[PDB]
DNA sequence: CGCTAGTCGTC
DNA sequence: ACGACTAGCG
């Protein structure tokens, strides 16, 4: 997520209840609603035992959007993108070090300290997205798992009018150039929503309101495939864009210290990495699901090399992305785990 | 004083 | 891993 984002476009938030999306198609960040789930029943899944409880707390949700006519496609993560491989490992390092240490809190007498400390110790497996994938399926609602981050399949659903909003937790969402996004939605229905018409009425942004330009504006605050520059959030980087007058990012970056009056000499490295973030949001790997074919976010733009571009997401055969879109090819091992068909019975028709 | 980043507390 | 919120910094 862009650090603070939601409180620095504010003016272009509103309260809403789903009801508003009676009749239409709203995709879900499901890995939002498993991780929930998996904090309900975090004590068991952490001890091994069996529990459908994630399941039961994600149907929740999905039968509250049923319930209001809404049609929800729910949006699962896939394969973890070349540059996130050292962080997912040490995530896991992070989660079986609070297993040991919640063990250790529950035989000290601090169970409820030890309850806390499971919560932050459980993995969301592409084995517990299947059970939420078969319990949706009964129920009629489409799924499909991205290739690689759920963040950019759910961008390409709304881009494509698949989709007419996205309920989600992460506000990435609309640095990928998302129309609506609803935040912080409860059980009930009720949630946030912003709109990228309503950047407009922000006046803290000033003219970085445009997709690109507002794109820029989160990598260079912080953002998930870049840590900023010391010293730089979204005011800062708010500030850099509306000062700037020259199409080139690049060149506006290598000068950033003099918009700012700040002492920065840009390391190689940043640069680079601000233009593989950049490349991220825009050409990430995403499954079209209607004609069964994996492509880029975005159609490739003047002299961009996909052959570059293999930290966005590697290419596979389309029979393959269309496995694991299924929830059919476990996204670790690349084995089957199931046979559902589309065909032999829709998002995929 | 505006802002950014480090600490306490929880889904 | 999320955000409240606060101190301390430029
Ligand atoms: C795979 C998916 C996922 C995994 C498990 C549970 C919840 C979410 N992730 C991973 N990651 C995470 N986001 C949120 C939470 Cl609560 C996480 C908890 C544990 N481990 C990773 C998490 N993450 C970070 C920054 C992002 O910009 C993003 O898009 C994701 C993201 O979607
Ligand atoms: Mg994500
Ligand atoms: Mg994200
Ligand atoms: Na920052
Ligand atoms: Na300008």
Same mark, same amino acid.
């Given at each position: 997520?862009?650090?603070?984002?939601?409180?620095?476009?504010?003016?272009?938030?509103?309260?809403?209840?789903?009801?508003?999306?009676?009749?239409?198609?709203?995709?879900?960040?499901?890995?939002?609603?498993?991780?929930?789930?998996?904090?309900?029943?975090?004590?068991?899944?952490?001890?091994?035992?069996?529990?459908?409880?994630?399941?039961?707390?994600?149907?929740?949700?999905?039968?509250?959007?049923?319930?209001?006519?809404?049609?929800?496609?729910?949006?699962?993560?896939?394969?973890?993108?070349?540059?996130?491989?050292?962080?997912?490992?040490?995530?896991?390092?992070?989660?079986?070090?609070?297993?040991?240490?919640?063990?250790?809190?529950?035989?000290?007498?601090?169970?409820?300290?030890?309850?806390?400390?499971?919560?932050?110790?459980?993995?969301?497996?592409?084995?517990?997205?299947?059970?939420?994938?078969?319990?949706?399926?009964?129920?009629?609602?489409?799924?499909?798992?991205?290739?690689?981050? %759920?963040?950019?399949? =759910?961008?390409?659903? +709304?881009?494509?009018? @698949? /989709?007419?909003? &996205?309920?989600?937790?992460?506000?990435? *969402?609309?640095?990928?150039?998302?129309?609506?996004?609803?935040?912080?939605?409860?059980?009930?229905?009720?949630?946030?929503?912003?709109?990228?018409?309503?950047?407009?009425?922000?006046?803290?942004?000033?003219?970085?309101?445009?997709?690109?330009?507002?794109?820029?504006?989160?990598?260079?605050?912080?953002?998930?495939?870049?840590?900023?520059?010391?010293?730089?959030?979204?005011?800062? %980087?708010?500030?850099? =864009?509306?000062?700037? +007058?020259?199409?080139? @990012? /690049?060149?506006? &970056?290598?000068?950033?210290?003099?918009? *700012?009056?700040?002492?920065?000499?840009?390391?190689?490295?940043?640069?680079?990495?601000?233009?593989?973030?950049?490349?991220?949001?825009?050409?990430?790997?995403?499954?079209?699901?209607?004609?069964?074919?994996?492509?880029?976010?975005?159609?490739?733009?003047?002299?961009?090399?996909?052959?570059?571009?293999?930290?966005?997401?590697?290419?596979?055969?389309?029979?393959?992305?269309?496995?694991?879109?299924?929830?059919?090819?476990?996204? +670790?091992?690349?084995?089957?785990?199931?046979?559902?068909?589309?065909?032999?019975?829709? *998002?995929?028709?």
């Amino acid at each position: 997520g862009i650090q603070g984002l939601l409180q620095f476009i504010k003016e272009a938030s509103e309260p809403i209840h789903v009801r508003k999306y009676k009749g239409q198609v709203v995709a879900v960040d499901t890995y939002c609603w498993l991780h929930k789930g998996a904090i309900a029943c975090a004590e068991k899944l952490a001890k091994g035992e069996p529990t459908d409880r994630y399941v039961g707390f994600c149907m929740k949700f999905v039968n509250m959007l049923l319930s209001h006519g809404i049609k929800p496609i729910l949006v699962f993560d896939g394969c973890t993108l070349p540059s996130k491989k050292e962080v997912e490992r040490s995530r896991r390092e992070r989660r079986q070090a609070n297993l040991l240490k919640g063990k250790q809190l529950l035989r000290e007498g601090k169970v409820s300290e030890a309850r806390e400390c499971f919560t932050r110790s459980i993995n969301i497996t592409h084995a517990m997205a299947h059970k939420v994938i078969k319990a949706a399926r009964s129920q009629g609602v489409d799924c499909l798992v991205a290739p690689y981050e %759920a963040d950019a399949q =759910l961008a390409y659903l +709304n881009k494509a009018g @698949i /989709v007419q909003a &996205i309920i989600t937790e992460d506000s990435d *969402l609309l640095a990928f150039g998302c129309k609506k996004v609803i935040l912080k939605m409860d059980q009930f229905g009720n949630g946030l929503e912003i709109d990228q018409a309503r950047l407009g009425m922000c006046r803290q942004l000033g003219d970085v309101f445009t997709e690109e330009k507002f794109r820029y504006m989160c990598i260079l605050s912080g953002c998930d495939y870049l840590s900023s520059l010391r010293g730089i959030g979204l005011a800062k %980087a708010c500030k850099v =864009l509306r000062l700037a +007058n020259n199409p080139d @990012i /690049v060149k506006v &970056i290598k000068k950033i210290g003099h918009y *700012l009056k700040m002492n920065i000499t840009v390391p190689e490295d940043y640069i680079n990495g601000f233009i593989r973030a950049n490349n991220t949001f825009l050409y990430q790997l995403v499954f079209d699901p209607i004609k069964r074919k994996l492509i880029p976010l975005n159609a490739y733009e003047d002299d961009v090399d996909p052959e570059t571009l293999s930290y966005a997401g590697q290419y596979v055969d389309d029979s393959i992305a269309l496995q694991i879109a299924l929830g059919n090819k476990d996204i +670790n091992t690349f084995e089957q785990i199931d046979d559902y068909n589309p065909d032999t019975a829709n *998002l995929y028709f």
